[PDB]
Amino acid sequence: LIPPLINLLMSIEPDVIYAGHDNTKPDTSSSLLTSLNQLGERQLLSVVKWSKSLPGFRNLHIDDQITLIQYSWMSLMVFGLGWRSYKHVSGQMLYFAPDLILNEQRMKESSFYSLCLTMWQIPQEFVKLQVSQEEFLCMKVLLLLNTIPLEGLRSQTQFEEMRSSYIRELIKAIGLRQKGVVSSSQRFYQLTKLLDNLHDLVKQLHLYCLNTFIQSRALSVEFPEMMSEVIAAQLPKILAGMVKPLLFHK
Ligand SMILES: Cc1noc(C)c1-c1ccc(CNS(=O)(=O)c2c(C)nn(C)c2Cl)cc1
């Protein structure tokens, strides 16, 4: 049967989040980007709410909690996108929200299309690996815990205990299906290498975000208030490499 912590993770998953996209009039790049930003503002709230129910997290110093969220928001959102796209449309469209699903036709702008192809590697890997919901839920928590400041965290001990606990839980998740030590271990390698590889992908999304943000008035792209602050607070420092990404492999 399903381990308790995984059952809890399932129960604290956010409910479906709508973009609120005006689905009548057609896409310009800038209107589509505004909708994505509006959706991202709703997803950020939902990430912050989720984190308050996530076992272990609230017990870290409040500054660590804020930092871990500001560092991981993009990863969490690309990972969420991959899962939904995998689950709902067999990884063959980008399922941002039920009212915002993008197929190839709706990605005109080449820079944005390039970005979408990059994000698309995640749903493709989920399909290839056949990631279970149980593995995903533990992987997601490890993403929240996958980048820390160069100095480390105020609650460094508690943080490392928490990360360890979700790594064991992922190994439990893997065991639900993957029987046998060699298959289990190869599977662990694969899923944690996927997490390692997300740092690279996410760096491209970070740069595109800060660019679009600085140029927002020239592009007519709207950035809501909470998103604007996470970007202003941390994105230049993150892009400048002034953070320590955690890696499962050398
Ligand atoms: C929402 C959502 N779901 O997955 C992703 C990725 C998002 C998302 C994440 C971040 C942002 C911030 N603005 S943005 O740079 O213009 C951007 C990024 C980064 N990705 N996308 C799809 C956009 Cl628009 C907007 C949407």
Swiss-Prot record:
Residues 5-250 are annotated as: AF2. Progesterone binds at residue 84. Residues 1-231 form the NR LBD domain. Phosphorylated on multiple serine sites. Several of these sites are hormone-dependent. Sumoylation is hormone-dependent and represses transcriptional activity. Sumoylation on all three sites is enhanced by PIAS3. Desumoylated by SENP1. It is found in: Nucleus; Cytoplasm. It comes from the Eukaryota. In reproductive tissues the expression of isoform A and isoform B varies as a consequence of developmental and hormonal status. Isoform A and isoform B are expressed in comparable levels in uterine glandular epithelium during the proliferative phase of the menstrual cycle. Expression of isoform B but not of isoform A persists in the glands during mid-secretory phase. In the stroma, isoform A is the predominant form throughout the cycle. Heterogeneous isoform expression between the glands of the endometrium basalis and functionalis is implying region-specific responses to hormonal stimuli. Composed of three domains: a modulating N-terminal domain, a DNA-binding domain and a C-terminal ligand-binding domain. Interacts with SMARD1 and UNC45A. Interacts with CUEDC2; the interaction promotes ubiquitination, decreases sumoylation, and represses transcriptional activity. Interacts with PIAS3; the interaction promotes sumoylation of PR in a hormone-dependent manner, inhibits DNA-binding, and alters nuclear export. Interacts with PRMT2. Isoform A interacts with NCOR2. Isoform B (but not isoform A) interacts with NCOA2 and NCOA1. Isoform B (but not isoform A) interacts with KLF9. Interacts with GTF2B. Belongs to the nuclear hormone receptor family. NR3 subfamily. The steroid hormones and their receptors are involved in the regulation of eukaryotic gene expression and affect cellular proliferation and differentiation in target tissues. Depending on the isoform, progesterone receptor functions as a transcriptional activator or repressor. This is Progesterone receptor. The chain holds residues 683 to 932 of 933 of the full protein.
